[PDB]
C-alpha cells in the first residue's frame, strides 16, 4: 500500500499589514491516506476556532484541505501550521513567513 507525506504552505489571504484583520491559511496537499490533524499556532499555542474546506483529491489521487482562521498580524506574533499524519514520525511545523 503506498502512502504520501503532506506538502504544507502557510500564508495569508491578503498581503499582511500589522493591526489589519486578515485570514491565516494552511494548505495541506499531496497526502494519502485521508485522515490528518492540522493546528494553527500563535506563539506556539493552538488557535481554537479553525475551519477547514471539504476533503477533495487531485489527478494522482492525493488529498488536499485548506485550514483557515481570522487573525490580525503584528510585528511580535509568530504563526505556524502543525500537521500530524500516519506517514510522519513527528509533527511537521511550518512557520508563517509573510513573503512566502
Amino acid at each position: 500500500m503506498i502512502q504520501r507525506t503532506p506538502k504544507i504552505q502557510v500564508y495569508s489571504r491578503h498581503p499582511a499589514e500589522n493591526g489589519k484583520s486578515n485570514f491565516l491559511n494552511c494548505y495541506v496537499s499531496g497526502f494519502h491516506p485521508s485522515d490528518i490533524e492540522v493546528d494553527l499556532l500563535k506563539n506556539g499555542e493552538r488557535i481554537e476556532k479553525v475551519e477547514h474546506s471539504d476533503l477533495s483529491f487531485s489527478k494522482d489521487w492525493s488529498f488536499y484541505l485548506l485550514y483557515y482562521t481570522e487573525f490580525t498580524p503584528t510585528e511580535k506574533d509568530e504563526y505556524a501550521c502543525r500537521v500530524n499524519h500516519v506517514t510522519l514520525s513527528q509533527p511537521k511545523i511550518v512557520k508563517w513567513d509573510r513573503d512566502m
Binding site: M1, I2, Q3, R4, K7, Q9, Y11, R13, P15, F23, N25, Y27, S29, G30, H32, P33, S34, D35, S53, D54, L55, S56, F57, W61, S62, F63, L66, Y68, D99, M100
Partner: protein
C-alpha cells in the same frame, strides 16, 4: 470551455464504525456541493450560492443517489478486501472521480470515470466511453462484471446526457460568478541572501481559474536551476495565489524576467526588478 467533476472517497474504519463517505462536486475550480456520511444532516448540502436556488426535489434526488453510491462503496470495500487477500484489521480507501467537459457552445467535448484503491489506479473508462482499462488482475474481475452488465452504457448515457445538461444550467444560474476570468495581480520582491546573492520572488494573486504559468528567464532563456515554484494555492475567497523565486548573482537582477500566462490576460505579462 467548462467542466463538472465529482470526487468520492470511502474509507473503512476498523476500530470505529461504517465506512466514512465524502462527496464534493465542482464546476471548473468552484465547489458547489458536498455530502459527508458523518455529518448530522445526512443530506447533499449547497457549497456555492447559485445552487441554493434549486428546490427540495433537487436535494432529495441528489441525497438519495449519493447515499446509494455510499452503499455500493461500502460493499465494494468488502469485495476488494477479498480480491487482494487483506485482513479485516486494516483501513482501505476507494476513490472515484467522474465528469464531463463542454465547449463554449455547451456541447459535449469529453467524459471521464476513474476509480482507485489505496491511492492507486484500479479501473478507468476509456475516452470512447464504451470499454474499460484495468490496472491489475483484481480490476480485470471488476472489468468482466462491468462488461457483462453493460455498465459502460449507463456511464455514457449520464456523461453525454444529464452531466452536460445540468452543467449548462449551473453555468447559467451561476453566470454572475462562474463565467469570470480574474487576471493575476502581480509584483516582485527582492531579499539579499548574502553579500553576493539575492532572491527575486514573482507573485500572482487574486486569479481565477487556477491554471497559471510563472517562468523565470535569464537573457530570454528559460531558467530551471536555482528556482522554486510553489503549488498554486487557494486564498479561500474564490481566488488562487502562486509564486516563483530565483536566486541571482547580486547586481545581475536586471538580467531576469518573470512571465505570467493566464486565461484572463489578453497579452502575456513580464516583470523585471526596478
Amino acid at each position: 470551455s467548462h467542466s463538472m467533476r465529482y470526487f468520492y472517497t470511502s474509507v473503512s474504519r476498523p476500530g470505529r464504525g461504517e465506512p466514512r463517505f465524502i462527496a464534493v462536486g465542482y464546476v471548473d475550480d468552484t465547489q458547489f456541493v458536498r455530502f459527508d456520511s458523518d455529518a448530522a444532516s445526512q443530506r447533499m448540502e449547497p457549497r456555492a450560492p447559485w445552487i441554493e436556488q434549486e428546490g427540495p426535489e433537487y436535494w432529495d434526488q441528489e441525497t438519495r443517489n449519493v447515499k446509494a453510491q455510499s452503499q455500493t462503496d461500502r460493499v465494494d470495500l468488502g469485495t476488494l478486501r477479498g480480491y487482494y487477500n487483506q485482513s479485516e484489521d486494516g483501513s482501505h480507501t476507494i476513490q472515484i472521480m467522474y465528469g464531463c467537459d463542454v465547449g463554449p457552445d455547451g456541447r459535449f467535448l469529453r467524459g471521464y470515470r476513474q476509480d482507485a484503491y489505496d491511492g492507486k489506479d484500479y479501473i478507468a473508462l476509456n475516452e470512447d466511453l464504451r470499454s474499460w482499462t484495468a490496472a491489475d488482475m483484481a480490476a480485470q474481475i471488476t472489468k468482466r462484471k462491468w462488461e457483462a452488465a453493460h455498465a459502460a452504457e449507463q456511464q455514457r448515457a449520464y456523461l453525454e446526457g444529464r452531466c452536460v445538461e445540468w452543467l449548462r444550467r449551473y453555468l447559467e444560474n451561476g453566470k454572475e460568478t462562474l463565467q469570470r476570468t480574474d487576471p493575476p495581480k502581480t509584483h516582485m520582491t527582492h531579499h539579499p541572501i548574502s553579500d553576493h546573492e539575492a532572491t527575486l520572488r514573482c507573485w500572482a494573486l487574486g486569479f481565477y481559474p487556477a491554471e497559471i504559468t510563472l517562468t523565470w528567464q535569464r537573457d530570454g532563456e528559460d531558467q530551471t536551476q536555482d528556482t522554486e515554484l510553489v503549488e498554486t494555492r487557494p486564498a479561500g475567497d474564490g481566488t488562487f495565489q502562486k509564486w516563483a523565486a530565483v536566486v541571482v548573482p547580486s547586481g545581475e537582477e536586471q538580467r531576469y524576467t518573470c512571465h505570467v500566462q493566464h486565461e484572463g490576460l489578453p497579452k502575456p505579462l513580464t516583470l523585471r526588478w526596478e
